[PDB]
Amino acid sequence: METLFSGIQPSGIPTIGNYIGALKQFVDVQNDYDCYFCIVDQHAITMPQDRLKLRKQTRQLAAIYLASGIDPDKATLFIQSEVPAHVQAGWMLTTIASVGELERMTQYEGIPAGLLTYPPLMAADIVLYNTNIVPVGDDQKQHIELTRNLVDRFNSRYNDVLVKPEIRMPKVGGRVMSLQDPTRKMSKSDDNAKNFISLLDEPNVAAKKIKSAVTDSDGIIKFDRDNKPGITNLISIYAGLTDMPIKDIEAKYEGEGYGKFKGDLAEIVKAFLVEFQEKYESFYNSDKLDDILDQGRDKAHKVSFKTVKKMEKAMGLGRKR
Amino acid sequence: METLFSGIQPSGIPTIGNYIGALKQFVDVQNDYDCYFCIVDQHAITMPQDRLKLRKQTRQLAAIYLASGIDPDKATLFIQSEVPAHVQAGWMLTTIASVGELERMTQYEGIPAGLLTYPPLMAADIVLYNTNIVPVGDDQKQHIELTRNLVDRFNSRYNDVLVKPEIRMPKVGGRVMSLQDPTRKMSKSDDNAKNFISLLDEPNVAAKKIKSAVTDSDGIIKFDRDNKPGITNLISIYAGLTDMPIKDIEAKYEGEGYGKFKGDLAEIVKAFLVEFQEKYESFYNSDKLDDILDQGRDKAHKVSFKTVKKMEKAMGLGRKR
Ligand SMILES: O=C(O)[C@H]1Cc2c[nH]c3cccc(c23)S1
Ligand SMILES: O=C(O)[C@H]1Cc2c[nH]c3cccc(c23)S1
């Protein structure tokens, strides 16, 4: 079975685009892949962070992943700083990286040093779990390239202990675009809040955003990206939330206009978030959340400890006991 | 009681100059100061290292410190990589350092990144134990300046958790110079092996080095650095190993020439190393060495864990449990 590793920034609430694109797919692929979902709070502090904002965000992301259906027995859901192997292996790989290499990553008071030195910690996050696949986007290609190069360098210089990962998302979800800018991807950090639907948006507010999505006044319910990106994006959201095939959606709304479709979709979005946020609040406000995060931490520690120890022996750190 | 922290490079055997200058003084000040003696194997790998050379060197330094009289109950003698707090706190301080700051430290395949990023780990080594004094030389002034600045930055930005250290050696030992270059300090890495006496030199070989020290053919036994640095350096070694006051040495050898003094000193050096190396071999070849290093690791972990947890809470890493 292949191992998947995904790093999760505690720096913002995922949107329904992130849910349709990734989170919902993780809920299915966690049965067929050995999945690690790591809330990277040590990467988060490379940026300026408010320390209560950060601890709250971490719990929030954990709760959102659990509310999505991420299963702490099937997958390993943990907080990066709670597993020392990450900075242990991150330091080991730093020593074999070059300054030039790190500087070229930064391209693709002063400048905080974490912004230059985090890539070997990213590599460590991945290779500690013998990861085969990382489900990231084009913006992370250089980081995986460096990861693979560090693995090759480590194995070449000391001896074979580390596995090279590939960029692969096992089941790509639909691409969800900005509701009032259909040519750009939906983003949680938009300055136009009508562009995205947050998973923690009030369900009535989300339904209004479906209604304020920028489309023609009326038309047929047909999937057509290049000519009607507005209604097409909504069809994608509809398909992402109901699992109805797109051709099935077109056949269901044959002879219908936009108002009926957008009305049904707004109610679908509202019902989805009502159900999602009830699970979210129950995890977020429960004592079991710390029990779950402890269990995930212990699972990750068990696996990454052996990797760290193999690395330490290969470099000659510590003792032979 | 003040806390002292000394980092120990596992990269070479200390000389009798290092013994007279530092190690012997540590054996006394460990009664009056809370001393941490940390074998920094994670700093060692910032340089190119042979991995069996490194693990052996680490054990060797531990044994040399114990053979010197460093007492694992009075002081805390441990290996850096065995205490995760060092890289945990090292990463936290990295995020508040600036690239410019780190680059200016480097001044005072490519360039290994550890050579740029190690200073915040040095700062972490120190401040984890609430250190008041660090017994280092002029070459480390920039590193302590950065340490103090990182502590100020950390306390200013988050809240008061870290203590600023000072450069202070509580009891300075004698300065021991190169045996065949009396104007330079003795150094374990000299290309002229007659210049230094290693603590692991064969005792007969050391006695020959006392005899091959560069001095006048003959003279009085008088301490005179500027005019007779050769015999003066030998008087310093004699004083360092016997604790005989220098004026007492001059009075003892009134009416004596160099051959009698150098003969007595060579025999003193030989007897010292015979006794030193018997203790060294017994520690180096004993099973108790791992017991001792475990105990030191546990002592250091207990203290540095609390510091790390205070730092994590201040930055908002992890969870409030
Ligand atoms: O910001 C992001 O999306 C990246 C954050 C991150 C840290 N460590 C890993 C490992 C695998 C994947 C990712 C990450 S994704
Ligand atoms: O190379 C050396 O001498 C330095 C190595 C080192 C690493 N971390 C500390 C903390 C205090 C003092 C020192 C060190 S001395």
Author numbering:
A (entry chain A), B (entry chain A): 1 to 108, 117 to 329
Sentences copied from the publication:
Chuangxinmycin (CXM) is a promising antimicrobial compound targeting bacterial tryptophanyl-tRNA synthetase (TrpRS), an essential enzyme in protein synthesis. TrpRS catalyzes the ligation of Trp to its cognate tRNA, forming tryptophanyl-tRNA (Trp-tRNA), which is required for the accurate translation of genetic codes into proteins. Importantly, bacterial TrpRS exhibits significant structural and functional differences compared to its mammalian counterpart, making it an attractive target for the development of selective antibiotics. Structurally, CXM is a tryptophan (Trp) mimic but is characterized by a unique dihydrothiopyran heterocycle, which distinguishes it from other known antibiotics and contributes to its distinct physicochemical properties.
To investigate the tolerance of the TrpRS pocket, two analogues of CXM, 3-demethylchuangxinmycin (dCXM) and 3-methylchuangxinmycin (mCXM), were tested. All analogue complexes are isomorphous with the corresponding CXM complexes (ESI†), and the binding modes are nearly identical (ESI†). The flexibility of dCXM leads to diverse conformations across the three chains of the SaTrpRS/dCXM complex. Consistent with its more flexible conformation and reduced hydrophobic surface area, dCXM demonstrates significantly lower inhibitory activity compared to CXM.
